[PDB]
Design a protein around this motif. Structure first.
Motif, PDB file in Angstrom:
ATOM      1  N   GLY A 162       1.683 -26.502  -2.436  1.00  0.00           N
ATOM      2  CA  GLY A 162       3.289 -26.565  -4.068  1.00  0.00           C
ATOM      3  C   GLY A 162       4.563 -26.897  -3.144  1.00  0.00           C
ATOM      4  O   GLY A 162       5.566 -27.767  -3.420  1.00  0.00           O
ATOM      5  N   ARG A 176       3.833 -30.805  -2.239  1.00  0.00           N
ATOM      6  CA  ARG A 176       3.882 -31.640  -3.784  1.00  0.00           C
ATOM      7  C   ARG A 176       5.428 -31.496  -4.063  1.00  0.00           C
ATOM      8  O   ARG A 176       5.829 -32.750  -4.612  1.00  0.00           O
ATOM      9  N   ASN A 177       6.124 -30.575  -4.033  1.00  0.00           N
ATOM     10  CA  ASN A 177       7.679 -30.301  -4.752  1.00  0.00           C
ATOM     11  C   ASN A 177       8.808 -31.755  -2.974  1.00  0.00           C
ATOM     12  O   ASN A 177       9.772 -32.664  -4.157  1.00  0.00           O
ATOM     13  N   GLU A 229       7.068 -34.587  -4.524  1.00  0.00           N
ATOM     14  CA  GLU A 229       8.281 -35.357  -5.478  1.00  0.00           C
ATOM     15  C   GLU A 229       9.583 -35.614  -5.405  1.00  0.00           C
ATOM     16  O   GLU A 229      10.085 -36.732  -6.857  1.00  0.00           O
ATOM     17  N   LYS A 265      11.801 -27.852  -9.334  1.00  0.00           N
ATOM     18  CA  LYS A 265      10.344 -27.387  -8.674  1.00  0.00           C
ATOM     19  C   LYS A 265       8.946 -27.316  -9.713  1.00  0.00           C
ATOM     20  O   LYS A 265       9.102 -26.768 -11.041  1.00  0.00           O
ATOM     21  N   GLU A 266       7.850 -27.418  -9.513  1.00  0.00           N
ATOM     22  CA  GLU A 266       6.214 -27.221 -10.518  1.00  0.00           C
ATOM     23  C   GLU A 266       6.141 -25.689 -11.198  1.00  0.00           C
ATOM     24  O   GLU A 266       5.712 -25.508 -11.734  1.00  0.00           O
ATOM     25  N   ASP A 267       6.933 -24.975 -10.059  1.00  0.00           N
ATOM     26  CA  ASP A 267       7.250 -23.323 -10.579  1.00  0.00           C
ATOM     27  C   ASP A 267       8.083 -23.338 -11.620  1.00  0.00           C
ATOM     28  O   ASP A 267       8.246 -21.936 -12.298  1.00  0.00           O
TER      29      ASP A 267
END
Ligand SMILES: [Cs+]
Ligand SMILES: [Cs+]
Ligand SMILES: [Cs+]
Length: 138
Positions: free
Chosen positions: A11, A14-15, A18, A124-126
């Motif tokens: 993650g 990934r973050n 992005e 962020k994705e979370d």
């Protein structure tokens, strides 16, 4: 212009990817587990990141455990050669831009080396907010 040594299964990686894209550039993506840096390149990355060799080592992966790397029995060059032979030991992501190189842990470290500002808010994705629409770090 920008390179990221990326793990799609992380993650943090990934973050970071992005956030790069949210600054308006598509980086060169190197899947380091399959295409690790050469020794010379890894030595240069570490120098430019300003951290120790051991600080780049990823704990909690099979070679770290089985080679006993938690113990203080290894020189910097011994650890570098383990990283080259077992690239999952290289923590991630590493980002190179014209401004510098960072181990982007946590991901928002990458904001230091991105030349152009985030183009809008970033979450962020979370769901952790990083920058608001105005560009302020939270
Ligand atoms: Cs390489
Ligand atoms: Cs910056
Ligand atoms: Cs997380």
């Amino acid at each position: 212009n920008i390179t990221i040594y990326h793990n799609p299964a992380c993650g943090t990686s990934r973050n970071t990817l992005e956030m790069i894209r949210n600054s308006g550039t598509e980086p060169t993506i190197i899947l380091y587990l399959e295409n690790p840096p050469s020794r010379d390149e890894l030595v240069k990355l570490i120098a430019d990141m300003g951290i120790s060799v051991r600080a780049l080592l990823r704990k909690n992966v099979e070679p770290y455990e089985q080679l006993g790397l938690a113990e203080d029995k290894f020189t910097d060059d011994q650890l570098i050669d383990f990283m080259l032979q077992h690239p999952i030991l290289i923590n991630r992501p590493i980002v190179v831009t014209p401004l510098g190189t960072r181990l982007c842990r946590p991901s928002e470290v990458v904001l230091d080396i991105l030349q152009d500002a985030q183009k809008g808010a970033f979450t962020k994705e979370d769901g952790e907010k990083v920058v608001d629409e105005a560009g302020k770090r939270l």
